[PDB]
Write a protein that binds this ligand. Structure first.
Ligand SMILES: Oc1cc(-c2ncc3c(N4C[C@H]5CC[C@@H](C4)N5)nc(OC[C@]45CCCN4C[C@@H](F)C5)nc3c2F)c2ccccc2c1
Ligand SMILES: Nc1nc2c(ncn2[C@@H]2O[C@H](COP(=O)(O)OP(=O)(O)O)[C@@H](O)[C@H]2O)c(=O)[nH]1
Ligand SMILES: [Mg+2]
Length: 168
């Protein structure tokens, strides 16, 4: 089994740091903000061996046809914001609508991720994030790429959401 996972969200929220924790087991400071890359990892989740193919998105805000078709191959999406950046939380709606648009579907596996939970300078309350996730009908996972809090949980929860979708 293989799952195509895509990590989206505003610049600086920790998409690259979360991905590199999952894949390479270390915390990277100031990874080049412009680099989009992909990684594969073999995991066991609830007894099922699978390959996670993870796209760590980056780059300019552009909407080419090639970009839509490429994003459309994603089976599940992490919607990442940082808990110290209210604008990144406000931007979650945008990324969700673009995912719906390219997938031509109201039911796309997604997980809301509030990253940088190790920082004291919080501006987005856990209750606001839980309420947003409830409104979308998706899970909310608190993470820190720095301490590895919630990292496996975020990705594995997204796989569980894909499996639920495939059962419908
Ligand atoms: O063809 C596509 C294209 C995208 C797509 N690709 C890149 C985006 C992009 N950048 C890339 C990364 C992340 C931030 C920065 C620029 N570096 N930024 C935004 O939005 C940014 C905000 C919020 C809205 C207005 N702008 C201005 C400010 F407010 C902030 N959206 C993007 C975006 F939708 C798709 C995304 C998901 C599903 C299918 C897609 C299909
Ligand atoms: N304290 C803390 N810093 C983080 C966390 N995740 C990312 N960072 C830092 O925030 C900055 C932006 O992270 P990055 O992974 O490049 O974000 P991206 O633009 O979403 O790929 C970098 O300096 C990271 O080291 C986190 O969970 N906690
Ligand atoms: Mg990055």
């Amino acid at each position: 089994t293989e799952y195509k996972l895509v990590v989206v969200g505003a610049d600086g929220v920790g998409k690259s740091a979360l991905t590199i924790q999952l894949i390479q087991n270390h915390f990277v400071d100031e990874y080049d903000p412009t680099i989009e890359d992909s990684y594969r990892k073999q995991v066991v989740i609830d007894g099922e061996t699978s390959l996670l193919d993870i796209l760590d998105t980056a780059g300019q805000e552009e909407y080419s046809a090639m970009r839509d078709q490429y994003m459309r191959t994603g089976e599940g999406f992490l919607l990442v914001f940082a808990i110290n950046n209210t604008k990144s939380f406000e931007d979650i709606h945008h990324y969700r609508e673009q995912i719906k648009r390219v997938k031509d579907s109201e039911d796309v596996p997604m997980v809301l991720v509030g990253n940088k939970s190790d920082l004291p300078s919080r501006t987005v309350d856990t209750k606001q994030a839980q309420d947003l996730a409830r409104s979308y009908g998706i899970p909310f996972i608190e993470t820190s790429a720095k301490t590895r809090q919630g990292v496996d949980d975020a990705f594995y929860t997204l796989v569980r959401e894909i499996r639920k979708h495939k059962e419908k």
